[PDB]
C-alpha cells in the first residue's frame, strides 16, 4: 500500500511527461508541413529557431521520461519483492 502509492504517483507523472512530448512533437510536425508548403509554392530564419526551440523541449522531456521510467521499474521490482 505504501509502495503502491509511490508507484502510482510515478506512473501518473510519466503519463504527463509522454503527453507533453506528444504535444511538443505535434508543433514540430506543423513546422515540417509549413516548410513543405513553402517549397511547394516555388516549384524562414525564424523557422530554424522554432525547430531548435521545440527540440530542446522534447529532449528535455525524453531525458526526464527516461529517468522516471527507471524509477518506476525499480519500485515495481521492490513491490514484487515485498509481495512474495
Amino acid at each position, epitope marked *: 500500500t505504501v509502495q503502491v502509492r509511490k508507484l502510482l504517483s510515478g506512473i501518473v507523472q510519466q503519463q504527463s511527461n509522454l503527453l507533453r512530448a506528444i504535444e511538443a512533437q505535434q508543433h514540430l510536425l506543423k513546422l515540417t508541413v509549413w516548410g513543405i508548403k513553402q517549397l511547394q509554392a516555388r516549384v524562414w530564419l525564424q523557422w530554424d529557431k522554432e525547430i*531548435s526551440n521545440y*527540440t*530542446h523541449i522534447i*529532449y*528535455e522531456l525524453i*531525458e*526526464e521520461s*527516461q*529517468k*522516471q521510467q*527507471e*524509477k518506476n*521499474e*525499480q519500485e515495481l*521490482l521492490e513491490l514484487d519483492k515485498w509481495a512474495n
Partner: antibody, heavy 126, light 110 residues
Framework: ALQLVQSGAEVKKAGSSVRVSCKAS????????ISWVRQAPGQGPQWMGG????????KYAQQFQGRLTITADTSTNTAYLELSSLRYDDTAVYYC???????????????????WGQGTLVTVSS | VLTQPPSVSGTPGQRVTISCSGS????????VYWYQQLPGTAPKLLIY???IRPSGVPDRFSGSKSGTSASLAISGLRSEDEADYYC????????????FGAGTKLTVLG
C-alpha cells in the same frame, strides 16, 4: 535513477589480464548500451568499446580490436572489461557509461553518455 | 583529434568561451557533446546534442556550433566552475567512433 558503481582498482605487470566490473544500482540497463572509455592521467578521454546487454552486440575501437573483450551479464546487471597483452601506455582511469539512445544503439548519430561510473585506477608498472 | 585550447581564464562574473576545432567528418556533420570534469570526479555531461542541456545544469552554460568548429559559452563564472572541459563528437573516419578533445582548464583566477 540509474547509477554506476565500479570496483577493482589494481596494479598489473606488462602482459597481464585485468578484469574491471561496472555494476548498476537504482535501475536496470535493459534497453540501453553501456560503453567503456579510458582517460590517461593528464591526457583526455578515449573511447574503448561498447556492448548491448539485451542483444549481445559488441563494438571495438581499431586500437584495441583483438586484445579487448567486453561482456555484460543481465541476470546480475554487471558489465565487465577485460584486457589481454597489457602494455605500459595502458595506465589510465577506466570509466563505464551508457548511451541514452535506445533505438539503433551504435553509430546512429548518437553518443549521449549521461550516468558515468566512479572510475577505477588501472596501473601498468612492473 | 578534436583541437582544444590549453587554458582560458576569467574573473568572477565574466563570460568564457571554449573553442573546439574539428574536421568535416566529425563536427561538420554530427552532434557535439560537452563534459565537465571536477578534479577527482567522473566527467559529467554538460551539453548534449548541439546546445541541448541536461537536468541540473544551470542556464548560464550554453553550447554553440557553426561549421566544423564548436564553442562552449560559460556566462557568470563561479568558484564551482573551475574544472576540465572536453568536447566530443561521433566520427565517420577510420580512426574510430566517438572522438574526444584534449581538454581545456578553466580558472576562476583569484
Amino acid at each position: 535513477a540509474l547509477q554506476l558503481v565500479q570496483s577493482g582498482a589494481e596494479v598489473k605487470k606488462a602482459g597481464s589480464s585485468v578484469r574491471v566490473s561496472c555494476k548498476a544500482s537504482g535501475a536496470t540497463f535493459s534497453s540501453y548500451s553501456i560503453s567503456w572509455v579510458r582517460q590517461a592521467p593528464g591526457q583526455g578521454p578515449q573511447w574503448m568499446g561498447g556492448i548491448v546487454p539485451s542483444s549481445g552486440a559488441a563494438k571495438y575501437a581499431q586500437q584495441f580490436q583483438g586484445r579487448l573483450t567486453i561482456t555484460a551479464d543481465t541476470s546480475t546487471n554487471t558489465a565487465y572489461l577485460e584486457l589481454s597483452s597489457l602494455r605500459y601506455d595502458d595506465t589510465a582511469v577506466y570509466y563505464c557509461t551508457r548511451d541514452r539512445s535506445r533505438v539503433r544503439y551504435f553509430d546512429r548519430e548518437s553518443g549521449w553518455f549521461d550516468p558515468w561510473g566512479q572510475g577505477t585506477l588501472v596501473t601498468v608498472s612492473s | 583529434v578534436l583541437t582544444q585550447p590549453p587554458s582560458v581564464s576569467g574573473t568572477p562574473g565574466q563570460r568564457v568561451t571554449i573553442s573546439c576545432s574539428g574536421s568535416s567528418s566529425n563536427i561538420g556533420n554530427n552532434y557535439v557533446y560537452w563534459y565537465q570534469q571536477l578534479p577527482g570526479t567522473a566527467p559529467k555531461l554538460l551539453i548534449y546534442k548541439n546546445n541541448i542541456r541536461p537536468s541540473g545544469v544551470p542556464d548560464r552554460f550554453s553550447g554553440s556550433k557553426s561549421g566544423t568548429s564548436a564553442s562552449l559559452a560559460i556566462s557568470g563564472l563561479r568558484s564551482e566552475d573551475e574544472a576540465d572541459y572536453y568536447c566530443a563528437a561521433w566520427d565517420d573516419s577510420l580512426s574510430g567512433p566517438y572522438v574526444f578533445g584534449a581538454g581545456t582548464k578553466l580558472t576562476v583566477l583569484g
